[PDB]
Coordinates of C-alpha atoms and ligand atoms in Angstrom, one line a residue:
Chain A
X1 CA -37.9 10.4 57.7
X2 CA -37.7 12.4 54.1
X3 CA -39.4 10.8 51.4
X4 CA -39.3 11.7 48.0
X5 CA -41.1 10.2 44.9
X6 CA -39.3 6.8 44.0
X7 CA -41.0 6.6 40.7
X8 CA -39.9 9.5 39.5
X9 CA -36.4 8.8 40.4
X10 CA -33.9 7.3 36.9
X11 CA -31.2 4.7 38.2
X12 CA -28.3 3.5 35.9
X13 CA -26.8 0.3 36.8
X14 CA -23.6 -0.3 35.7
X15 CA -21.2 -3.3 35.5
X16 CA -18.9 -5.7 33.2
X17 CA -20.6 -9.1 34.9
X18 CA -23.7 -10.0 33.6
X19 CA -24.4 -11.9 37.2
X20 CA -22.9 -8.6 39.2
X21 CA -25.4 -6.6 37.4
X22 CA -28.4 -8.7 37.5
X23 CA -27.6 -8.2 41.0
X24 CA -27.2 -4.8 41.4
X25 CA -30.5 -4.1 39.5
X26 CA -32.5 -6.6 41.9
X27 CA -31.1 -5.0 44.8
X28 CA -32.1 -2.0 43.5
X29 CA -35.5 -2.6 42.8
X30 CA -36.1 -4.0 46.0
X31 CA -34.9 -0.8 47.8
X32 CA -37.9 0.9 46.4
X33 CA -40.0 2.1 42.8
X34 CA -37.0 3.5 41.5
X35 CA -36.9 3.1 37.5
X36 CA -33.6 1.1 36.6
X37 CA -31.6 1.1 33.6
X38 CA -28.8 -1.6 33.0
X39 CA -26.0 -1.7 31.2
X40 CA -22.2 -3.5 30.6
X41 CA -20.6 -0.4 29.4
X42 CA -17.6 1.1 31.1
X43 CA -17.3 4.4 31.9
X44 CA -15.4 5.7 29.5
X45 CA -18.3 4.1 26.9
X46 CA -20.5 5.9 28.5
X47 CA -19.2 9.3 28.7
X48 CA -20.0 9.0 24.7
X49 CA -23.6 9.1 25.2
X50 CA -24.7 12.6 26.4
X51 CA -28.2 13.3 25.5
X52 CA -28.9 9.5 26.7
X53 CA -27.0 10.2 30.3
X54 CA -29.1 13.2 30.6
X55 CA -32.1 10.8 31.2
X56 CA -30.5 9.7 34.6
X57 CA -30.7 11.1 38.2
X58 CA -27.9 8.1 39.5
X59 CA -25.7 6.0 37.9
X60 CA -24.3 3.4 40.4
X61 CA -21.0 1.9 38.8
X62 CA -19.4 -1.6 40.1
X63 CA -15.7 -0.7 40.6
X64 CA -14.3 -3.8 40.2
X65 CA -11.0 -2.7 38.8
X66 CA -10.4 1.0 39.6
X67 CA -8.0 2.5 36.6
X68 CA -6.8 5.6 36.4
X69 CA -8.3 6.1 33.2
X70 CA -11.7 4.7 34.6
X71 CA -11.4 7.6 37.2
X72 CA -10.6 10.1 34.6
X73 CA -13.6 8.9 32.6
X74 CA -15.7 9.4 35.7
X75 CA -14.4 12.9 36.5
X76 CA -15.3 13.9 32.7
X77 CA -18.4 12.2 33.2
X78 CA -19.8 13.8 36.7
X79 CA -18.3 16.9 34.7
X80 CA -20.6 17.2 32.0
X81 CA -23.7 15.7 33.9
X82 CA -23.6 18.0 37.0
X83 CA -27.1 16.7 37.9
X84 CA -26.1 12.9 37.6
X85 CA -25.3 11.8 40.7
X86 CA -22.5 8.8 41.1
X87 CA -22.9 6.1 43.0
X88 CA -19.2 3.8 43.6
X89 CA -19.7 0.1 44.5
X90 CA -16.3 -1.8 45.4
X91 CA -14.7 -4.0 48.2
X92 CA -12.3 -1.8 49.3
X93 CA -12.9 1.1 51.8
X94 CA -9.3 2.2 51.8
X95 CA -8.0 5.7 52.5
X96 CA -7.2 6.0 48.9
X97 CA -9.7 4.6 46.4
X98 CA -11.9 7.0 48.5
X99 CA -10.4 10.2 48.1
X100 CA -9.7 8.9 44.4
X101 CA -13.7 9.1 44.0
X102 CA -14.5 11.6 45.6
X103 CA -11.6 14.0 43.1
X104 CA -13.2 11.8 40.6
X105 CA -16.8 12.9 41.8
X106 CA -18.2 10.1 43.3
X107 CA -21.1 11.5 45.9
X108 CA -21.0 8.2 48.0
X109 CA -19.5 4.5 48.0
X110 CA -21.1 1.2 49.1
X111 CA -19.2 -1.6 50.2
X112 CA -19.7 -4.8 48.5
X113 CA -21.3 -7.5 49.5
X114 CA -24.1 -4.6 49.1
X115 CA -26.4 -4.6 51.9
X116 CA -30.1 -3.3 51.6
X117 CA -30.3 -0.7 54.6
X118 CA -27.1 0.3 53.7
X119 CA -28.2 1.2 49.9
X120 CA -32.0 2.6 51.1
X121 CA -30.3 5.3 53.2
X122 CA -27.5 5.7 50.0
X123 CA -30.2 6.0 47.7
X124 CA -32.8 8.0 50.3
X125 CA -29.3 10.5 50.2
X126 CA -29.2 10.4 46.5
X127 CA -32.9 11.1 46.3
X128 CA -32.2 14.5 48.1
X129 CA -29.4 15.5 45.8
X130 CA -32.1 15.1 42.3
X131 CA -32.6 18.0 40.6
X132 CA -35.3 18.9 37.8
X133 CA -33.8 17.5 34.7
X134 CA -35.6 19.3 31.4
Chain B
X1 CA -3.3 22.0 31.6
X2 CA -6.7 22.9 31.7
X3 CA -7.5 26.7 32.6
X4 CA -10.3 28.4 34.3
X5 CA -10.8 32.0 34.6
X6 CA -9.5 32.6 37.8
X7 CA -11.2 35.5 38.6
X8 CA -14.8 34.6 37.4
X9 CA -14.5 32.2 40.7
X10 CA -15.6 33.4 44.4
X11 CA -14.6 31.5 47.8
X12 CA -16.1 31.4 50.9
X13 CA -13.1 30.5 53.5
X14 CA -15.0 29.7 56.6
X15 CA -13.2 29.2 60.2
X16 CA -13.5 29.8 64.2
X17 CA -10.4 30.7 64.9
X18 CA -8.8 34.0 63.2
X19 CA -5.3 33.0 62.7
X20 CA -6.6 29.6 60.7
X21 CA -9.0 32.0 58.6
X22 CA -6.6 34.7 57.8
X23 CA -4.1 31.5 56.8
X24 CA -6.3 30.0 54.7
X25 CA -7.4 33.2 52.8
X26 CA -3.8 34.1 52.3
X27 CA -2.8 30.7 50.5
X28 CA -6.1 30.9 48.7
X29 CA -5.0 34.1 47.6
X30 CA -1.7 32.3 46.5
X31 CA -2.9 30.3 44.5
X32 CA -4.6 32.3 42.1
X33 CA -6.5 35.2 41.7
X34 CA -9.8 33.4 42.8
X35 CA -12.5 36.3 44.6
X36 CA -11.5 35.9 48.3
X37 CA -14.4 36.3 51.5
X38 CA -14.0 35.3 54.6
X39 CA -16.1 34.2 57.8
X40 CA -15.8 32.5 61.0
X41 CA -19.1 31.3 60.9
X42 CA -20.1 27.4 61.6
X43 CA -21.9 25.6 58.6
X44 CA -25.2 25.8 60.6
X45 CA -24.9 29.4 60.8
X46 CA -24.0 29.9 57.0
X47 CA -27.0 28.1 56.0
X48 CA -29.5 30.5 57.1
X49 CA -28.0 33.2 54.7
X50 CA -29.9 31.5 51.4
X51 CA -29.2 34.5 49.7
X52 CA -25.4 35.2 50.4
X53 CA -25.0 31.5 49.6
X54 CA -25.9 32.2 46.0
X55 CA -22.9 34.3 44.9
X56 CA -20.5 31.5 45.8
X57 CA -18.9 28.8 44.0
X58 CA -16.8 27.1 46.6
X59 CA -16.9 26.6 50.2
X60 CA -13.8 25.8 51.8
X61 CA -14.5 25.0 55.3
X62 CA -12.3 24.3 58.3
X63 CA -13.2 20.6 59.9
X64 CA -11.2 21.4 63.2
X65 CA -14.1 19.4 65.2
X66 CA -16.0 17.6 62.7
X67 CA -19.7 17.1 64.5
X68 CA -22.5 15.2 63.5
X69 CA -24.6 18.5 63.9
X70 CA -22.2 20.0 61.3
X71 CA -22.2 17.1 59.0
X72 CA -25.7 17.3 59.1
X73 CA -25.8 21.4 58.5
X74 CA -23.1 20.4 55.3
X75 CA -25.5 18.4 54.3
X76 CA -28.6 21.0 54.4
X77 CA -26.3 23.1 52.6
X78 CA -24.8 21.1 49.9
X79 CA -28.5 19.9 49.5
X80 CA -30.4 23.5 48.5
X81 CA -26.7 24.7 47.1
X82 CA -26.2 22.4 44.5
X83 CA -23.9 24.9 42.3
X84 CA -21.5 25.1 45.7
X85 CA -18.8 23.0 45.9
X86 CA -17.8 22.0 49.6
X87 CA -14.2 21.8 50.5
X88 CA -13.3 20.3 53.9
X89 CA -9.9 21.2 55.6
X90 CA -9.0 18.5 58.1
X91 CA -6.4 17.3 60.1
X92 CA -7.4 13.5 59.6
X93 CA -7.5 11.6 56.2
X94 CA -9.2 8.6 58.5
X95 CA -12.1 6.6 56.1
X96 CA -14.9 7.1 59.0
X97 CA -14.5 11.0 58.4
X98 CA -14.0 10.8 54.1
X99 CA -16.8 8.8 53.5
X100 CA -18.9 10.9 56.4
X101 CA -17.6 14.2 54.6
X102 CA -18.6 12.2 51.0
X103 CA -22.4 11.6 52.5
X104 CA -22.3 15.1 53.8
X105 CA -21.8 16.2 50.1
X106 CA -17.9 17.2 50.5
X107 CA -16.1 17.0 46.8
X108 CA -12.6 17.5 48.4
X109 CA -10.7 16.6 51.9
X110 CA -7.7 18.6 52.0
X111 CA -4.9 17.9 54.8
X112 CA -4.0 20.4 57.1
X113 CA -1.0 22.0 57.2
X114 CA -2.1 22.8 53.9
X115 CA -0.2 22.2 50.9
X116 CA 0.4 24.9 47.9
X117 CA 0.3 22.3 44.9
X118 CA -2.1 20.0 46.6
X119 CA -4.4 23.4 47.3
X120 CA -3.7 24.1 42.9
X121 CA -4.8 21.0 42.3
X122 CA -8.0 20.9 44.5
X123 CA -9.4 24.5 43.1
X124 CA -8.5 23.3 39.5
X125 CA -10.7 19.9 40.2
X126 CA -13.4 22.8 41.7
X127 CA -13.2 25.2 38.9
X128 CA -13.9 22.4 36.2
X129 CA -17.3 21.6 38.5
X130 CA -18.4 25.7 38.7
X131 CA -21.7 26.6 37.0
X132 CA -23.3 29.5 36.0
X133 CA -24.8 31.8 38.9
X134 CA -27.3 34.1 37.9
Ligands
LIG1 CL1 -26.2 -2.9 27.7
LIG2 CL1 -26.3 10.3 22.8
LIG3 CL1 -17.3 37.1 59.5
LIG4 CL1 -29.7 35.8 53.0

């Protein structure tokens, strides 16, 4: 019942699988106007791009295989982006992995298979969260 | 093993009962020498002070009876408080109320009886995700 500007709204898509991310993006785009961005990179990869992160209101990462150095990558990551808001998609809603994103500073996790009312009201929350980027 | 300037950081504890506030405070007041204020005020009365919001970089609130009208007022006030970091204080580490807290905009579930090092820990991860205030 809050709308917000799609279009003006930058999503990164990552994930390791070229079929996984395909997927992801598709989902994506059919959740609304949203401008998507994919890539394979991992997030300790892209960490190393700071001026090019910057670009990007949401970054929606496939958690395939939660590391602890993954997690680490992410918390220095939501660190130095404060307006990039991450997204966690995985197959495991346990207690744990959770909390892990959330100390990590994941905003919100999807369960995979991912399911389009469930992402439209994860993405209509991320929507609210966008602040001006310069 | 890495520092913030302890005192450069202001709390808002925030309970209904007085015995769980002045306890909190206290171990707050334990763990570092972190600026201190206290209320017993419920999240949807703490919004409507835009102003007084402003000067705070964490929120540490007690989640004694965890309501949708108070997820929803956490919500409201994560959303125009970007630079305040929300820390709930439960008694419950159940997935339903993390990933409710998460979409809320919560950064941290603590566990209640409340832990010294765990406490360290959480306002290290908070310090690391304070921003300048004007
Ligand atoms: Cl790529
Ligand atoms: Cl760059
Ligand atoms: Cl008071
Ligand atoms: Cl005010």
């Amino acid at each position: 019942e809050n709308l917000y500007f799609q279009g003006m709204i930058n999503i990164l898509v990552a994930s390791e699988d070229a079929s996984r991310l395909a997927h992801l993006a598709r989902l994506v785009g059919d959740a609304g106007r949203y401008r998507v961005t994919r890539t394979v990179g991992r997030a300790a990869q892209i960490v190393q791009r700071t001026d090019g992160l910057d670009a990007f209101d949401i970054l929606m990462i496939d958690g395939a295989a939660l590391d602890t150095a993954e997690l680490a990558a992410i918390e220095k990551l939501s660190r130095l982006h404060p307006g990039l808001t991450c997204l966690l998609v995985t197959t495991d809603a346990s207690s744990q992995t959770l909390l892990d994103a959330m100390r990590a500073g994941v905003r919100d996790v999807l369960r995979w298979p991912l399911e389009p009312r469930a992402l439209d009201d994860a993405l209509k929350r991320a929507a609210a969260q966008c602040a001006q980027r310069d």
